[PDB]
C-alpha cells in the first residue's frame, strides 16, 4: 500500500 501522509 502507500502511506497516508502525502509528500508534495
Amino acid at each position, epitope marked *: 500500500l502507500q*502511506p*497516508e501522509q502525502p509528500f508534495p
Partner: antibody
Amino acid sequence: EVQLVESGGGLVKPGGSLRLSCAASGFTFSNAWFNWVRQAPGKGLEWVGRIKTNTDGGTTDYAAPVKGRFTISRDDSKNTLYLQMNSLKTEDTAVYYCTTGEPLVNHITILDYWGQGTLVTVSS
Amino acid sequence: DIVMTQSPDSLAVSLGERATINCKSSQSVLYSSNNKNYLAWYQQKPGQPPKLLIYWASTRESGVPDRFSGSGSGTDFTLTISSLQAEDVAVYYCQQYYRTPPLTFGGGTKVEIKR
C-alpha cells in the same frame, strides 16, 4: 501563533465518562486532521485516535486499547475538538494531548502542533 | 503495526559535546516510490508537550536550531545534537508515519547534561 488549549481533565471513577476539549486558533481548523495522544505518568507517548476533515467524511480511527469506549468528534464552527471517554479504566490515567499537523503543508500524520495537555485520573 | 525501538535509554553528554540517539523500526519506513523516510523526532522537555524537531528523517522543523540533525534510512535512524546546550535536556521520541494508523512511537531516550 498556533494555539491548542485543552480543558475538561480531572478526576473520574472507573466506568464513568468524561469529555476533553481542545480549542484551536492560528490555522485552518476545518482542513486539519486532529489526533489525541496520551502519556501515562513516567511512560511514553501512545496515540489514542484521530478524526479526519469533514470533507473527508469525518472518519475516526482509534487505537486498540481504546476502541469501543472512546469517541472523537469535531465542531468546525467552534474550532473545538473533543475526546469523549467512556467505560474508563484506571489504565486510562494519563495526560491527554490534542495534536495536529499544519494543514497548509498537508501534514496529517506529522504532528506540528500540540496542546499543553490535561491530566485525567481514573480512581474510585 | 510498526514497532519503534530506541537506544540508549539514557544519555549524559558534556556541554558543547555531541549527543547521538538511535531509533529502529520493525520494518522499512523508506517507501521506494519516492525516496522519503516517513519518520519524525520529538523533543519533550519536563512538564511540556512534545515539540516536533525533525521529519522526513532529516528535514529540520522551522525555528529548530541547526545543532539538531537527523539521518538514517529504511529501518535505522539517528538524531544528533552536535553542540549540546543545557536547554536541550529532554526526552526525545521517534515516530513512524509510514503505515498510517496507528501512529506509533519509540520508548524515548533521556538526554541530560554531564557536569
